Symmetry: D2
Subunit: 107 residues, 4 copies
Protein backbone atom coordinates (compact mmCIF):
# COMPACT_ATOMS: atom_id res chain seq x y z
CA UNK A 1 0.00 0.00 0.00
CA UNK A 2 3.01 2.25 -0.75
CA UNK A 3 2.72 5.71 -2.28
CA UNK A 4 4.35 6.37 -5.65
CA UNK A 5 5.03 9.55 -7.47
CA UNK A 6 6.37 10.50 -10.91
CA UNK A 7 8.66 13.56 -11.15
CA UNK A 8 10.09 15.39 -14.11
CA UNK A 9 12.82 17.98 -13.70
CA UNK A 10 16.60 18.44 -13.79
CA UNK A 11 19.39 17.07 -11.63
CA UNK A 12 20.87 19.82 -9.36
CA UNK A 13 24.30 18.13 -9.45
CA UNK A 14 26.05 15.06 -10.85
CA UNK A 15 24.74 11.75 -9.43
CA UNK A 16 26.80 10.69 -6.43
CA UNK A 17 27.70 7.01 -6.82
CA UNK A 18 29.01 5.24 -3.69
CA UNK A 19 29.49 1.74 -2.41
CA UNK A 20 28.30 0.70 1.07
CA UNK A 21 30.36 -1.78 3.20
CA UNK A 22 27.96 -4.43 1.87
CA UNK A 23 29.45 -3.85 -1.63
CA UNK A 24 26.17 -2.40 -2.96
CA UNK A 25 26.02 0.73 -5.11
CA UNK A 26 24.00 3.85 -4.33
CA UNK A 27 23.32 6.92 -6.47
CA UNK A 28 22.01 9.99 -4.71
CA UNK A 29 20.80 12.79 -6.89
CA UNK A 30 18.07 15.43 -6.46
CA UNK A 31 15.44 16.49 -9.01
CA UNK A 32 14.24 20.06 -9.69
CA UNK A 33 10.75 20.31 -11.24
CA UNK A 34 10.31 23.91 -12.44
CA UNK A 35 7.22 25.86 -13.66
CA UNK A 36 7.92 28.16 -16.66
CA UNK A 37 9.09 30.22 -10.55
CA UNK A 38 9.60 28.46 -7.16
CA UNK A 39 10.58 24.81 -7.88
CA UNK A 40 9.99 21.38 -6.36
CA UNK A 41 13.17 19.77 -5.10
CA UNK A 42 13.28 16.05 -4.35
CA UNK A 43 16.15 14.05 -3.00
CA UNK A 44 16.24 10.70 -4.82
CA UNK A 45 18.33 7.61 -4.22
CA UNK A 46 18.64 4.58 -6.48
CA UNK A 47 20.43 1.32 -5.84
CA UNK A 48 22.41 -1.48 -7.33
CA UNK A 49 23.05 -1.72 -11.05
CA UNK A 50 20.67 1.12 -12.06
CA UNK A 51 22.62 3.43 -9.76
CA UNK A 52 25.86 2.80 -11.73
CA UNK A 53 23.87 3.22 -14.93
CA UNK A 54 22.60 6.60 -13.66
CA UNK A 55 26.11 7.73 -12.77
CA UNK A 56 27.51 6.88 -16.21
CA UNK A 57 24.51 8.23 -18.13
CA UNK A 58 23.21 11.33 -16.33
CA UNK A 59 24.84 14.61 -15.32
CA UNK A 60 24.18 18.03 -13.84
CA UNK A 61 21.18 19.74 -15.53
CA UNK A 62 20.01 16.44 -17.08
CA UNK A 63 16.25 16.35 -17.63
CA UNK A 64 14.77 13.19 -16.16
CA UNK A 65 11.68 11.21 -15.35
CA UNK A 66 11.60 9.43 -12.02
CA UNK A 67 8.98 7.10 -10.63
CA UNK A 68 9.35 5.71 -7.13
CA UNK A 69 8.04 5.65 -3.55
CA UNK A 70 7.80 8.55 -1.17
CA UNK A 71 9.61 7.89 2.08
CA UNK A 72 9.04 10.54 4.83
CA UNK A 73 10.51 10.75 8.30
CA UNK A 74 9.60 13.30 11.07
CA UNK A 75 11.69 14.68 13.97
CA UNK A 76 12.78 17.60 16.18
CA UNK A 77 11.26 18.62 19.59
CA UNK A 78 14.36 18.28 21.89
CA UNK A 79 16.12 20.74 19.48
CA UNK A 80 13.99 22.90 17.19
CA UNK A 81 10.47 21.55 16.64
CA UNK A 82 8.28 20.47 13.73
CA UNK A 83 10.75 19.23 11.10
CA UNK A 84 10.29 16.82 8.16
CA UNK A 85 12.47 14.70 5.82
CA UNK A 86 11.38 13.49 2.32
CA UNK A 87 12.83 11.49 -0.60
CA UNK A 88 12.08 9.16 -3.50
CA UNK A 89 13.21 5.58 -3.61
CA UNK A 90 13.44 5.40 -7.36
CA UNK A 91 12.01 2.37 -9.19
CA UNK A 92 12.80 3.73 -12.68
CA UNK A 93 14.62 6.70 -14.09
CA UNK A 94 15.40 7.82 -17.65
CA UNK A 95 16.67 10.89 -19.49
CA UNK A 96 13.61 12.60 -20.96
CA UNK A 97 13.53 12.86 -24.76
CA UNK A 98 11.33 16.01 -25.01
CA UNK A 99 14.36 18.23 -25.52
CA UNK A 100 17.03 15.56 -26.11
CA UNK A 101 18.10 12.42 -27.99
CA UNK A 102 19.87 9.52 -26.47
CA UNK A 103 22.08 6.79 -27.76
CA UNK A 104 20.85 3.84 -25.64
CA UNK A 105 23.29 0.96 -24.88
CA UNK A 106 22.71 -2.55 -23.47
CA UNK A 107 24.62 -4.24 -20.59
Amino acid sequence: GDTTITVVGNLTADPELRFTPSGAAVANFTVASTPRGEALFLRCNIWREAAENVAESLTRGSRVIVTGRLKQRSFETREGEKRTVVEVEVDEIGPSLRYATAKVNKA
Copy 2:
Protein backbone atom coordinates in the same frame (compact mmCIF):
# COMPACT_ATOMS: atom_id res chain seq x y z
CA UNK B 1 -9.15 20.65 -15.59
CA UNK B 2 -7.18 17.77 -14.13
CA UNK B 3 -6.43 15.56 -17.08
CA UNK B 4 -6.34 11.86 -16.15
CA UNK B 5 -2.62 11.11 -16.16
CA UNK B 6 -0.57 8.03 -15.67
CA UNK B 7 2.92 6.65 -15.62
CA UNK B 8 3.92 3.50 -17.42
CA UNK B 9 7.00 1.41 -17.54
CA UNK B 10 7.54 -1.31 -20.09
CA UNK B 11 9.22 -2.12 -23.40
CA UNK B 12 8.48 -1.17 -26.98
CA UNK B 13 6.75 -4.02 -28.77
CA UNK B 14 8.00 -2.69 -32.09
CA UNK B 15 10.20 0.10 -33.46
CA UNK B 16 8.53 3.56 -33.13
CA UNK B 17 6.29 4.39 -36.03
CA UNK B 18 6.97 8.04 -37.08
CA UNK B 19 4.31 9.71 -39.23
CA UNK B 20 3.21 13.21 -40.27
CA UNK B 21 0.04 15.24 -40.73
CA UNK B 22 -0.42 16.48 -44.32
CA UNK B 23 1.01 19.90 -43.26
CA UNK B 24 4.04 18.28 -41.58
CA UNK B 25 3.44 17.77 -37.87
CA UNK B 26 5.43 14.81 -36.54
CA UNK B 27 3.50 12.12 -34.69
CA UNK B 28 5.10 8.88 -33.67
CA UNK B 29 3.06 6.03 -32.30
CA UNK B 30 4.28 3.00 -30.45
CA UNK B 31 2.99 0.56 -27.84
CA UNK B 32 4.22 -0.40 -24.43
CA UNK B 33 4.20 -3.83 -22.89
CA UNK B 34 4.16 -3.73 -19.08
CA UNK B 35 4.20 -7.19 -17.50
CA UNK B 36 3.49 -6.78 -13.78
CA UNK B 37 4.73 -9.36 -11.20
CA UNK B 38 3.64 -11.35 -8.09
CA UNK B 39 4.50 -14.27 -5.71
CA UNK B 40 3.36 -17.86 -6.37
CA UNK B 41 2.37 -19.59 -3.09
CA UNK B 42 3.29 -23.26 -2.45
CA UNK B 43 6.49 -23.39 -4.56
CA UNK B 44 7.09 -20.43 -6.91
CA UNK B 45 9.31 -17.46 -6.03
CA UNK B 46 8.04 -14.59 -8.22
CA UNK B 47 6.29 -14.59 -11.62
CA UNK B 48 4.97 -12.37 -14.44
CA UNK B 49 1.26 -11.52 -14.50
CA UNK B 50 -0.89 -10.06 -17.28
CA UNK B 51 0.83 -8.07 -20.03
CA UNK B 52 -0.85 -4.71 -20.65
CA UNK B 53 -0.36 -3.21 -24.10
CA UNK B 54 -0.90 0.55 -23.90
CA UNK B 55 -1.07 2.29 -27.27
CA UNK B 56 1.00 5.49 -27.14
CA UNK B 57 1.26 8.39 -29.49
CA UNK B 58 3.44 11.51 -29.15
CA UNK B 59 3.87 14.83 -30.93
CA UNK B 60 6.35 17.34 -32.37
CA UNK B 61 10.08 17.13 -31.51
CA UNK B 62 9.68 14.63 -28.72
CA UNK B 63 8.23 12.34 -31.37
CA UNK B 64 11.22 12.91 -33.64
CA UNK B 65 13.58 12.41 -30.64
CA UNK B 66 11.84 9.26 -29.59
CA UNK B 67 12.26 8.02 -33.16
CA UNK B 68 16.02 8.53 -33.13
CA UNK B 69 16.38 7.06 -29.66
CA UNK B 70 14.04 4.10 -29.24
CA UNK B 71 13.62 0.63 -30.85
CA UNK B 72 11.74 -2.60 -30.38
CA UNK B 73 12.56 -3.84 -26.87
CA UNK B 74 13.47 -0.43 -25.48
CA UNK B 75 12.66 -0.30 -21.81
CA UNK B 76 10.80 2.95 -21.27
CA UNK B 77 9.21 5.15 -18.64
CA UNK B 78 6.32 7.12 -19.93
CA UNK B 79 4.25 9.78 -18.36
CA UNK B 80 1.21 11.14 -20.16
CA UNK B 81 -2.55 11.63 -20.28
CA UNK B 82 -5.39 9.26 -21.15
CA UNK B 83 -7.32 10.07 -24.29
CA UNK B 84 -10.09 8.15 -26.03
CA UNK B 85 -9.60 7.69 -29.76
CA UNK B 86 -12.41 6.37 -31.96
CA UNK B 87 -12.54 5.13 -35.58
CA UNK B 88 -14.30 3.10 -38.35
CA UNK B 89 -17.60 1.41 -34.81
CA UNK B 90 -15.95 2.03 -31.38
CA UNK B 91 -13.32 3.66 -29.12
CA UNK B 92 -9.81 2.68 -28.04
CA UNK B 93 -7.95 4.11 -25.09
CA UNK B 94 -4.50 5.56 -25.63
CA UNK B 95 -1.77 7.54 -23.86
CA UNK B 96 -0.85 11.03 -25.07
CA UNK B 97 2.82 11.21 -23.99
CA UNK B 98 4.00 14.24 -22.03
CA UNK B 99 7.41 12.76 -21.37
CA UNK B 100 9.28 9.59 -22.24
CA UNK B 101 12.71 8.15 -21.89
CA UNK B 102 14.57 4.85 -21.83
CA UNK B 103 14.93 3.36 -18.37
CA UNK B 104 18.44 3.27 -17.01
CA UNK B 105 17.41 0.00 -15.31
CA UNK B 106 19.44 -2.34 -17.51
CA UNK B 107 21.00 0.26 -19.81
CA UNK B 108 23.22 3.29 -20.11
CA UNK B 109 22.62 6.26 -22.33
CA UNK B 110 24.39 9.20 -23.96
CA UNK B 111 21.95 12.13 -23.77
CA UNK B 112 22.39 14.83 -26.44
CA UNK B 113 20.54 18.05 -25.72
CA UNK B 114 18.74 20.00 -28.42
CA UNK B 115 18.11 23.73 -27.83
Copy 3:
Protein backbone atom coordinates in the same frame (compact mmCIF):
# COMPACT_ATOMS: atom_id res chain seq x y z
CA UNK C 1 6.30 -5.72 -10.35
CA UNK C 2 5.14 -2.13 -10.62
CA UNK C 3 1.59 -2.39 -11.83
CA UNK C 4 0.60 0.51 -14.09
CA UNK C 5 -1.59 2.61 -11.81
CA UNK C 6 -3.61 5.73 -12.25
CA UNK C 7 -5.91 8.15 -10.54
CA UNK C 8 -9.15 9.33 -12.05
CA UNK C 9 -11.70 11.89 -11.14
CA UNK C 10 -15.07 12.11 -12.79
CA UNK C 11 -18.73 11.17 -12.41
CA UNK C 12 -20.62 7.92 -12.72
CA UNK C 13 -22.37 7.71 -16.08
CA UNK C 14 -24.87 5.28 -14.61
CA UNK C 15 -25.75 3.65 -11.29
CA UNK C 16 -23.14 1.02 -10.23
CA UNK C 17 -23.83 -2.39 -11.65
CA UNK C 18 -23.32 -5.00 -8.86
CA UNK C 19 -22.87 -8.61 -9.98
CA UNK C 20 -21.54 -11.91 -8.60
CA UNK C 21 -19.42 -14.86 -9.68
CA UNK C 22 -21.32 -18.18 -9.59
CA UNK C 23 -19.72 -18.93 -6.16
CA UNK C 24 -20.69 -15.50 -4.79
CA UNK C 25 -17.85 -13.01 -5.19
CA UNK C 26 -19.15 -9.45 -5.51
CA UNK C 27 -18.01 -7.45 -8.52
CA UNK C 28 -19.48 -4.10 -9.35
CA UNK C 29 -18.71 -2.37 -12.60
CA UNK C 30 -19.29 1.23 -13.48
CA UNK C 31 -17.78 3.86 -15.78
CA UNK C 32 -16.27 7.23 -15.13
CA UNK C 33 -16.63 10.33 -17.23
CA UNK C 34 -13.72 12.75 -16.80
CA UNK C 35 -14.10 15.92 -18.88
CA UNK C 36 -10.79 17.79 -18.74
CA UNK C 37 -10.62 21.62 -19.25
CA UNK C 38 -8.64 24.38 -21.04
CA UNK C 39 -8.59 28.11 -22.06
CA UNK C 40 -10.11 29.36 -25.34
CA UNK C 41 -7.94 32.13 -26.88
CA UNK C 42 -9.54 35.19 -28.53
CA UNK C 43 -12.76 35.30 -26.45
CA UNK C 44 -13.50 32.22 -24.30
CA UNK C 45 -12.62 31.98 -20.60
CA UNK C 46 -12.35 28.22 -19.89
CA UNK C 47 -14.03 25.21 -21.55
CA UNK C 48 -14.50 21.42 -21.38
CA UNK C 49 -12.32 19.22 -23.61
CA UNK C 50 -12.69 15.55 -24.54
CA UNK C 51 -14.71 13.29 -22.24
CA UNK C 52 -12.84 10.09 -21.35
CA UNK C 53 -15.00 7.13 -20.36
CA UNK C 54 -12.91 4.73 -18.27
CA UNK C 55 -14.57 1.38 -17.61
CA UNK C 56 -14.07 0.43 -13.95
CA UNK C 57 -14.67 -2.76 -12.10
CA UNK C 58 -14.12 -3.47 -8.38
CA UNK C 59 -14.18 -6.47 -6.07
CA UNK C 60 -15.38 -7.85 -2.71
CA UNK C 61 -16.67 -5.50 0.02
CA UNK C 62 -15.50 -2.32 -1.63
CA UNK C 63 -17.78 -3.31 -4.50
CA UNK C 64 -20.70 -3.82 -2.13
CA UNK C 65 -19.86 -0.49 -0.38
CA UNK C 66 -19.60 1.34 -3.64
CA UNK C 67 -23.03 -0.06 -4.52
CA UNK C 68 -24.65 1.31 -1.36
CA UNK C 69 -22.88 4.64 -1.70
CA UNK C 70 -22.72 5.69 -5.35
CA UNK C 71 -25.26 6.56 -8.11
CA UNK C 72 -25.40 8.00 -11.59
CA UNK C 73 -23.75 11.43 -11.42
CA UNK C 74 -21.64 10.67 -8.35
CA UNK C 75 -18.45 12.64 -8.48
CA UNK C 76 -15.68 10.19 -7.68
CA UNK C 77 -11.95 9.87 -7.15
CA UNK C 78 -10.61 6.53 -8.15
CA UNK C 79 -7.23 5.03 -7.79
CA UNK C 80 -6.46 1.67 -9.34
CA UNK C 81 -4.47 -0.37 -11.84
CA UNK C 82 -4.76 -0.76 -15.61
CA UNK C 83 -5.80 -4.18 -16.85
CA UNK C 84 -6.58 -5.38 -20.36
CA UNK C 85 -9.80 -7.33 -20.69
CA UNK C 86 -10.64 -9.22 -23.88
CA UNK C 87 -13.82 -10.91 -25.18
CA UNK C 88 -15.92 -12.27 -28.12
CA UNK C 89 -12.39 -10.37 -31.32
CA UNK C 90 -10.38 -7.76 -29.32
CA UNK C 91 -9.27 -6.11 -26.05
CA UNK C 92 -10.64 -3.25 -23.96
CA UNK C 93 -8.72 -1.35 -21.32
CA UNK C 94 -10.19 -1.06 -17.85
CA UNK C 95 -9.34 0.11 -14.32
CA UNK C 96 -9.16 -2.40 -11.47
CA UNK C 97 -10.09 -0.18 -8.50
CA UNK C 98 -7.87 -0.21 -5.43
CA UNK C 99 -9.72 2.64 -3.78
CA UNK C 100 -12.70 4.83 -4.56
CA UNK C 101 -14.78 7.46 -2.90
CA UNK C 102 -17.12 10.34 -3.68
CA UNK C 103 -15.38 13.67 -4.02
CA UNK C 104 -16.15 16.19 -1.32
CA UNK C 105 -15.82 18.83 -4.06
CA UNK C 106 -19.50 19.72 -4.32
CA UNK C 107 -20.83 17.31 -1.68
CA UNK C 108 -20.83 16.26 1.93
CA UNK C 109 -20.86 12.72 3.20
CA UNK C 110 -21.64 10.64 6.28
CA UNK C 111 -19.00 7.90 6.41
CA UNK C 112 -20.01 4.70 8.23
CA UNK C 113 -17.13 2.38 9.04
CA UNK C 114 -17.39 -1.38 8.69
CA UNK C 115 -14.98 -3.54 10.73
Copy 4:
Protein backbone atom coordinates in the same frame (compact mmCIF):
# COMPACT_ATOMS: atom_id res chain seq x y z
CA GLY D 1 4.24 21.17 -15.45
CA ASP D 2 3.19 20.64 -11.80
CA THR D 3 3.72 17.39 -9.91
CA THR D 4 0.70 15.50 -8.61
CA ILE D 5 0.41 12.67 -6.21
CA THR D 6 -2.40 10.43 -4.94
CA VAL D 7 -2.35 9.42 -1.25
CA VAL D 8 -4.46 6.99 0.71
CA GLY D 9 -4.36 6.90 4.50
CA ASN D 10 -6.10 8.23 7.61
CA LEU D 11 -6.48 11.73 9.02
CA THR D 12 -4.29 12.20 12.17
CA ALA D 13 -6.81 14.69 13.61
CA ASP D 14 -10.08 16.42 12.75
CA PRO D 15 -9.84 18.79 9.75
CA GLU D 16 -9.09 22.32 10.90
CA LEU D 17 -11.46 24.71 9.12
CA ARG D 18 -10.57 28.43 9.27
CA PHE D 19 -11.40 31.61 7.45
CA THR D 20 -8.68 34.00 6.25
CA PRO D 21 -9.21 37.83 6.37
CA SER D 22 -10.19 37.50 2.71
CA GLY D 23 -13.28 35.52 3.84
CA ALA D 24 -12.00 32.30 2.20
CA ALA D 25 -12.14 28.91 3.92
CA VAL D 26 -9.18 26.62 4.55
CA ALA D 27 -9.07 23.05 5.82
CA ASN D 28 -5.75 21.76 7.05
CA PHE D 29 -5.54 18.08 7.76
CA THR D 30 -2.69 15.54 7.50
CA VAL D 31 -2.82 12.05 5.96
CA ALA D 32 -1.15 8.90 7.34
CA SER D 33 -0.47 6.18 4.73
CA THR D 34 0.46 3.00 6.64
CA PRO D 35 1.94 -0.36 5.50
CA ARG D 36 0.38 -3.43 7.21
CA GLY D 37 5.28 -0.14 10.08
CA GLU D 38 6.77 3.38 9.66
CA ALA D 39 4.13 5.56 7.92
CA LEU D 40 4.03 8.39 5.38
CA PHE D 41 2.68 11.61 6.83
CA LEU D 42 1.54 14.42 4.55
CA ARG D 43 0.23 17.80 5.52
CA CYS D 44 -2.66 18.69 3.19
CA ASN D 45 -4.61 21.90 2.79
CA ILE D 46 -7.80 22.39 0.80
CA TRP D 47 -9.65 25.59 0.06
CA ARG D 48 -12.99 27.20 -0.46
CA GLU D 49 -16.20 25.19 -0.54
CA ALA D 50 -14.51 21.73 -0.55
CA ALA D 51 -12.73 22.70 2.67
CA GLU D 52 -16.09 23.23 4.46
CA ASN D 53 -17.30 19.99 2.91
CA VAL D 54 -14.22 18.20 4.33
CA ALA D 55 -14.80 19.65 7.78
CA GLU D 56 -18.44 18.53 7.91
CA SER D 57 -17.78 15.12 6.35
CA LEU D 58 -14.42 13.83 7.61
CA THR D 59 -13.02 13.22 11.08
CA ARG D 60 -10.07 11.82 12.99
CA GLY D 61 -9.09 8.34 11.70
CA SER D 62 -11.13 8.81 8.50
CA ARG D 63 -9.72 6.83 5.57
CA VAL D 64 -9.29 9.06 2.55
CA ILE D 65 -8.03 9.44 -0.98
CA VAL D 66 -6.30 12.68 -1.86
CA THR D 67 -4.99 13.84 -5.20
CA GLY D 68 -3.18 17.15 -5.47
CA ARG D 69 0.11 18.96 -6.11
CA LEU D 70 3.30 18.65 -4.13
CA LYS D 71 4.53 21.99 -2.87
CA GLN D 72 8.05 21.93 -1.27
CA ARG D 73 10.00 24.73 0.33
CA SER D 74 13.65 24.60 1.62
CA PHE D 75 15.39 26.59 4.39
CA GLU D 76 17.81 26.74 7.35
CA THR D 77 21.56 27.68 7.25
CA ARG D 78 21.58 30.78 9.58
CA GLU D 79 20.00 28.48 12.25
CA GLY D 80 20.30 24.72 11.84
CA GLU D 81 21.04 23.61 8.27
CA LYS D 82 19.48 21.39 5.62
CA ARG D 83 15.74 21.51 6.38
CA THR D 84 12.70 20.84 4.14
CA VAL D 85 8.93 21.56 4.13
CA VAL D 86 6.32 19.52 2.15
CA GLU D 87 2.53 19.47 1.61
CA VAL D 88 -0.29 18.65 -0.78
CA GLU D 89 -2.52 21.26 -2.30
CA VAL D 90 -5.52 19.01 -2.65
CA ASP D 91 -7.52 19.01 -5.89
CA GLU D 92 -9.91 16.24 -4.78
CA ILE D 93 -10.54 14.32 -1.61
CA GLY D 94 -13.10 11.64 -0.67
CA PRO D 95 -13.74 9.12 2.10
CA SER D 96 -12.56 5.75 0.78
CA LEU D 97 -15.24 3.07 0.50
CA ARG D 98 -12.94 0.01 0.90
CA TYR D 99 -13.83 -0.33 4.57
CA ALA D 100 -16.79 2.09 4.75
CA THR D 101 -20.11 3.25 3.29
CA ALA D 102 -21.14 6.80 2.85
CA LYS D 103 -24.42 8.59 2.58
CA VAL D 104 -23.52 11.24 -0.05
CA ASN D 105 -25.45 14.57 -0.05
CA LYS D 106 -25.67 17.38 -2.63
CA ALA D 107 -25.21 21.14 -2.02
